[PDB]
Amino acid sequence: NDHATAPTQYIEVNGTRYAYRSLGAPSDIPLICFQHFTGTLDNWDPLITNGLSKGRQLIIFDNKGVGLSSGTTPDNVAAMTADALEFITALGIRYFDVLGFSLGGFIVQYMAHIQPDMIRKIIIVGAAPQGVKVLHTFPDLIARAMQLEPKERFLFIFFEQSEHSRSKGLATLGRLYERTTDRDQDASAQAIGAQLTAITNWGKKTPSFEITSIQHPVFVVQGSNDEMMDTYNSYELFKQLPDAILSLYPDAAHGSFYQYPELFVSQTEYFLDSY
Protein backbone atom coordinates (compact mmCIF):
# COMPACT_ATOMS: atom_id res chain seq x y z
CA ASN A 1 0.00 0.00 0.00
CA ASP A 2 1.06 3.52 -0.80
CA HIS A 3 0.34 6.74 0.98
CA ALA A 4 -3.03 7.30 -0.70
CA THR A 5 -4.30 3.71 -0.22
CA ALA A 6 -2.88 2.46 3.09
CA PRO A 7 -5.83 1.97 5.48
CA THR A 8 -5.88 3.67 8.82
CA GLN A 9 -5.32 0.90 11.38
CA TYR A 10 -5.92 0.97 15.10
CA ILE A 11 -4.27 -0.73 18.05
CA GLU A 12 -5.41 -0.62 21.67
CA VAL A 13 -2.51 -0.26 24.16
CA ASN A 14 -2.80 0.39 27.93
CA GLY A 15 -6.24 2.03 27.47
CA THR A 16 -5.33 4.18 24.42
CA ARG A 17 -6.37 3.58 20.78
CA TYR A 18 -3.44 4.48 18.47
CA ALA A 19 -4.18 5.23 14.84
CA TYR A 20 -1.46 4.35 12.32
CA ARG A 21 -0.63 3.34 8.79
CA SER A 22 1.90 0.90 7.43
CA LEU A 23 3.37 1.58 4.01
CA GLY A 24 5.41 -0.63 1.80
CA ALA A 25 6.11 -4.32 2.22
CA PRO A 26 6.74 -5.60 5.74
CA SER A 27 10.48 -5.61 6.54
CA ASP A 28 12.80 -6.60 9.37
CA ILE A 29 13.87 -3.06 10.31
CA PRO A 30 10.94 -0.69 9.74
CA LEU A 31 11.25 3.13 9.69
CA ILE A 32 9.03 4.71 12.34
CA CYS A 33 8.07 8.34 11.58
CA PHE A 34 7.33 11.04 14.15
CA GLN A 35 5.23 14.02 13.10
CA HIS A 36 5.46 17.82 13.40
CA PHE A 37 3.45 20.36 15.52
CA THR A 38 -0.30 19.98 14.86
CA GLY A 39 0.36 17.39 12.13
CA THR A 40 -1.71 14.27 11.61
CA LEU A 41 -1.30 11.25 9.42
CA ASP A 42 -2.37 13.34 6.39
CA ASN A 43 0.41 15.97 6.89
CA TRP A 44 3.06 13.50 5.74
CA ASP A 45 4.26 14.23 2.20
CA PRO A 46 3.27 11.31 -0.04
CA LEU A 47 6.40 11.77 -2.12
CA ILE A 48 8.47 11.14 0.96
CA THR A 49 6.47 8.32 2.46
CA ASN A 50 6.04 6.62 -0.92
CA GLY A 51 9.69 7.13 -1.74
CA LEU A 52 11.05 5.74 1.49
CA SER A 53 8.54 2.85 1.63
CA LYS A 54 9.91 1.45 -1.64
CA GLY A 55 12.81 0.06 0.32
CA ARG A 56 11.43 -0.63 3.80
CA GLN A 57 8.27 -0.86 5.82
CA LEU A 58 7.30 2.63 6.98
CA ILE A 59 5.02 3.33 9.92
CA ILE A 60 3.28 6.67 10.37
CA PHE A 61 1.22 7.15 13.51
CA ASP A 62 -0.76 9.56 15.60
CA ASN A 63 0.73 9.83 19.07
CA LYS A 64 -1.65 9.81 22.10
CA GLY A 65 -4.54 12.24 21.69
CA VAL A 66 -3.56 13.39 18.20
CA GLY A 67 -6.09 13.00 15.38
CA LEU A 68 -7.77 9.59 15.39
CA SER A 69 -5.67 8.43 18.37
CA SER A 70 -7.62 8.55 21.59
CA GLY A 71 -6.73 10.00 24.95
CA THR A 72 -5.04 13.10 26.32
CA THR A 73 -1.85 14.41 24.72
CA PRO A 74 0.77 14.94 27.47
CA ASP A 75 2.56 18.27 27.90
CA ASN A 76 6.16 17.13 27.49
CA VAL A 77 8.47 15.28 25.12
CA ALA A 78 9.48 12.65 27.65
CA ALA A 79 5.89 11.44 28.02
CA MET A 80 5.32 11.54 24.27
CA THR A 81 8.36 9.34 23.90
CA ALA A 82 7.07 6.85 26.52
CA ASP A 83 3.70 6.79 24.74
CA ALA A 84 5.28 6.20 21.38
CA LEU A 85 7.31 3.34 22.79
CA GLU A 86 4.21 1.61 24.22
CA PHE A 87 2.67 1.85 20.74
CA ILE A 88 5.69 0.59 18.83
CA THR A 89 6.24 -2.27 21.26
CA ALA A 90 2.49 -3.21 21.01
CA LEU A 91 3.05 -3.71 17.27
CA GLY A 92 5.84 -6.20 18.10
CA ILE A 93 8.60 -3.98 16.70
CA ARG A 94 11.82 -4.33 18.75
CA TYR A 95 14.44 -2.72 16.51
CA PHE A 96 13.80 0.05 14.05
CA ASP A 97 15.03 3.21 12.36
CA VAL A 98 13.40 6.56 13.20
CA LEU A 99 12.58 9.76 11.30
CA GLY A 100 11.50 12.76 13.36
CA PHE A 101 10.29 16.08 11.93
CA SER A 102 10.08 19.19 14.17
CA LEU A 103 8.47 18.02 17.48
CA GLY A 104 9.09 14.49 16.23
CA GLY A 105 12.76 15.35 15.91
CA PHE A 106 12.83 16.11 19.65
CA ILE A 107 11.13 12.75 20.41
CA VAL A 108 13.68 10.71 18.42
CA GLN A 109 16.58 12.36 20.30
CA TYR A 110 14.97 11.58 23.66
CA MET A 111 14.11 8.02 22.53
CA ALA A 112 17.68 7.39 21.50
CA HIS A 113 18.73 8.51 24.97
CA ILE A 114 16.32 6.30 26.92
CA GLN A 115 16.07 3.30 24.60
CA PRO A 116 19.28 3.24 22.56
CA ASP A 117 19.20 -0.46 21.82
CA MET A 118 15.78 -0.32 20.11
CA ILE A 119 16.96 2.24 17.48
CA ARG A 120 19.37 1.59 14.64
CA LYS A 121 19.59 4.85 12.60
CA ILE A 122 18.07 8.27 13.20
CA ILE A 123 16.86 11.01 10.82
CA ILE A 124 16.17 14.48 12.29
CA VAL A 125 14.43 17.08 10.10
CA GLY A 126 13.73 20.66 11.12
CA ALA A 127 14.61 20.38 14.80
CA ALA A 128 17.08 21.40 17.51
CA PRO A 129 18.67 20.13 20.70
CA GLN A 130 17.21 20.64 24.16
CA GLY A 131 17.67 24.05 25.74
CA VAL A 132 17.83 26.29 22.72
CA LYS A 133 16.89 29.92 23.25
CA VAL A 134 14.97 30.26 19.97
CA LEU A 135 12.18 28.06 21.36
CA HIS A 136 11.60 30.47 24.27
CA THR A 137 9.75 32.57 21.70
CA PHE A 138 7.92 29.72 20.03
CA PRO A 139 4.60 30.87 21.55
CA ASP A 140 5.02 34.30 19.92
CA LEU A 141 5.84 32.66 16.57
CA ILE A 142 2.59 30.76 16.80
CA ALA A 143 0.72 33.97 17.89
CA ARG A 144 1.94 35.54 14.57
CA ALA A 145 1.01 32.48 12.53
CA MET A 146 -2.47 32.38 14.33
CA GLN A 147 -3.39 35.57 12.41
CA LEU A 148 -3.10 33.81 9.02
CA GLU A 149 -5.56 31.73 7.02
CA PRO A 150 -4.46 28.32 5.87
CA LYS A 151 -2.25 28.86 2.80
CA GLU A 152 -0.46 31.86 4.34
CA ARG A 153 -0.11 30.11 7.70
CA PHE A 154 1.45 27.08 5.94
CA LEU A 155 3.88 29.22 3.88
CA PHE A 156 4.77 31.30 6.97
CA ILE A 157 5.62 28.27 9.05
CA PHE A 158 7.30 26.10 6.45
CA PHE A 159 8.71 28.17 3.56
CA GLU A 160 11.03 31.04 2.69
CA GLN A 161 9.88 34.37 1.32
CA SER A 162 10.95 33.96 -2.30
CA GLU A 163 8.64 33.05 -5.16
CA HIS A 164 10.88 30.01 -5.67
CA SER A 165 10.28 28.73 -2.10
CA ARG A 166 6.63 29.75 -1.91
CA SER A 167 5.82 27.97 -5.19
CA LYS A 168 7.33 24.77 -3.80
CA GLY A 169 5.06 25.41 -0.81
CA LEU A 170 1.98 25.56 -3.05
CA ALA A 171 3.20 22.29 -4.63
CA THR A 172 3.35 20.72 -1.16
CA LEU A 173 -0.23 21.79 -0.42
CA GLY A 174 -1.33 20.02 -3.56
CA ARG A 175 0.59 16.87 -2.63
CA LEU A 176 -1.31 16.92 0.75
CA TYR A 177 -4.56 16.83 -1.34
CA GLU A 178 -3.70 13.44 -2.77
CA ARG A 179 -5.18 11.46 0.13
CA THR A 180 -8.81 11.40 -0.86
CA THR A 181 -10.23 8.62 1.22
CA ASP A 182 -10.17 7.55 4.94
CA ARG A 183 -8.46 10.77 6.01
CA ASP A 184 -7.35 11.46 9.57
CA GLN A 185 -9.10 13.87 11.91
CA ASP A 186 -7.41 17.20 12.64
CA ALA A 187 -5.08 17.30 15.65
CA SER A 188 -7.65 18.61 18.27
CA ALA A 189 -7.39 21.71 20.41
CA GLN A 190 -6.19 19.74 23.42
CA ALA A 191 -3.37 18.15 21.42
CA ILE A 192 -2.28 21.49 19.97
CA GLY A 193 -2.08 23.11 23.44
CA ALA A 194 -0.14 20.19 24.88
CA GLN A 195 2.32 20.26 21.97
CA LEU A 196 2.82 24.02 22.20
CA THR A 197 3.70 23.55 25.85
CA ALA A 198 6.02 20.62 25.10
CA ILE A 199 7.88 22.44 22.32
CA THR A 200 8.40 25.58 24.38
CA ASN A 201 9.68 23.57 27.32
CA TRP A 202 12.10 21.57 25.19
CA GLY A 203 13.81 24.95 24.81
CA LYS A 204 13.22 26.41 28.26
CA LYS A 205 14.28 23.49 30.38
CA THR A 206 17.93 22.75 31.06
CA PRO A 207 19.14 19.79 28.98
CA SER A 208 18.59 16.43 30.69
CA PHE A 209 21.06 14.41 28.62
CA GLU A 210 24.23 14.98 26.62
CA ILE A 211 23.75 15.09 22.84
CA THR A 212 27.29 13.73 22.52
CA SER A 213 26.06 10.50 24.11
CA ILE A 214 23.80 9.59 21.18
CA GLN A 215 26.12 7.21 19.34
CA HIS A 216 23.81 6.10 16.55
CA PRO A 217 24.28 7.12 12.92
CA VAL A 218 22.21 10.29 12.45
CA PHE A 219 21.17 12.20 9.35
CA VAL A 220 20.23 15.83 10.12
CA VAL A 221 18.33 17.84 7.45
CA GLN A 222 17.47 21.55 7.59
CA GLY A 223 16.79 24.48 5.30
CA SER A 224 18.83 27.67 4.96
CA ASN A 225 16.54 29.64 7.34
CA ASP A 226 14.29 27.76 9.75
CA GLU A 227 12.78 30.63 11.82
CA MET A 228 11.25 28.27 14.39
CA MET A 229 14.33 26.21 15.20
CA ASP A 230 17.28 28.39 13.89
CA THR A 231 19.21 26.69 11.10
CA TYR A 232 22.41 27.06 13.13
CA ASN A 233 20.99 24.67 15.70
CA SER A 234 21.22 21.92 13.08
CA TYR A 235 24.90 22.73 12.69
CA GLU A 236 25.04 22.44 16.50
CA LEU A 237 23.48 18.98 16.30
CA PHE A 238 26.10 18.02 13.72
CA LYS A 239 28.95 19.41 15.88
CA GLN A 240 27.84 17.69 19.06
CA LEU A 241 26.76 14.31 17.69
CA PRO A 242 29.60 11.86 17.09
CA ASP A 243 28.20 10.25 13.92
CA ALA A 244 25.90 12.72 12.17
CA ILE A 245 25.75 13.66 8.52
CA LEU A 246 24.31 17.16 7.93
CA SER A 247 22.45 18.33 4.81
CA LEU A 248 21.35 21.94 4.41
CA TYR A 249 18.97 22.84 1.58
CA PRO A 250 19.00 26.19 -0.26
CA ASP A 251 16.47 29.01 0.00
CA ALA A 252 14.35 26.93 2.34
CA ALA A 253 12.94 27.05 5.84
CA HIS A 254 11.37 24.85 8.50
CA GLY A 255 9.70 22.70 5.84
CA SER A 256 12.95 21.94 4.03
CA PHE A 257 12.06 18.35 3.08
CA TYR A 258 8.67 19.48 1.69
CA GLN A 259 10.56 21.92 -0.51
CA TYR A 260 12.90 19.26 -1.91
CA PRO A 261 11.19 15.92 -1.29
CA GLU A 262 12.99 13.95 -3.99
CA LEU A 263 16.38 15.22 -2.80
CA PHE A 264 15.40 14.19 0.74
CA VAL A 265 14.32 10.71 -0.36
CA SER A 266 17.52 10.21 -2.35
CA GLN A 267 19.70 11.19 0.56
CA THR A 268 17.68 9.33 3.21
CA GLU A 269 17.41 6.12 1.20
CA TYR A 270 21.18 5.95 0.89
CA PHE A 271 21.64 6.74 4.55
CA LEU A 272 19.28 3.97 5.68
CA ASP A 273 20.36 1.33 3.19
CA SER A 274 24.08 1.92 3.10
CA TYR A 275 25.72 4.32 5.53
Whole-number Å distance between alpha carbons of 261 and 266: 9
| Residue 167 sits in the site that holds Cl ion (CB under 5 A) | no
Interface with Cl ion (CB under 5 A), residue from 76, 115, 200, 225: 115
Separation CA 115–CA 250 (nearest Å): 34
Q: Could you tell which of a second copy, Cl ion, none binds residue 210, using a CB distance below 5 to 8 A set by kind? A: Cl ion
Contact 97, 29 (CB under 8 A): yes
Residues 30, 91 contacting (CB under 8 angstroms) = no
How many chain residues bind a second copy (CB under 8 A)? 22
At 251 the three-state DSSP class reads coil
Specify the pairing of strand 58-61 against strand 31-34: parallel
Quick check: helix, strand or coil at residue 205?
A: coil
Least CB distance to a second copy at residue 246 (A)? 4
Task: Indicate the burial class of 204 (C-beta count within 10 angstroms; 0-12, 13-18, 19 or more).
Answer: middle
Which of 244, 253, 254, 255 forms a contact with a second copy (CB under 8 A)? 244
Shortest Cβ distance from residue 222 to a second copy (Å)?
Answer: 10
- In the complex, least distance from residue 73 CB atom to Cl ion, rounded to whole angstroms: 8
CB 259 within 8 A of CB 234: no
- What does 258 bind: Cl ion, a second copy, none (CB cut-off 5 to 8 Å by kind)? none
d(CA 126, CA 103): 9
Residues 170-199 as x/- pattern, contact with Cl ion by CB under 5 A: ------------------------------
Q: Cβ neighbours of residue 239 under 8 Å, at least 6 residues apart? A: none
Does residue number 242 form part of the binding site for a second copy (CB under 8 A)?
yes
At closest approach, how far in Å is the CB of 23 from Cl ion? 19
Among 75, 178, 227, 251, binds a second copy (CB under 8 A): 251
Q: Does 262 bind a second copy (CB under 8 A)?
A: yes
Question: Is 201 strand, coil or helix?
Answer: helix
* Contact residues: Cl ion, CB under 5 A: 36-37, 71-72, 102, 115-117, 132-133, 209-210, 213, 260, 262-263
* Contact residues: a second copy, CB under 8 A: 224, 235, 238-239, 241-251, 262-263, 266-267, 270, 274-275
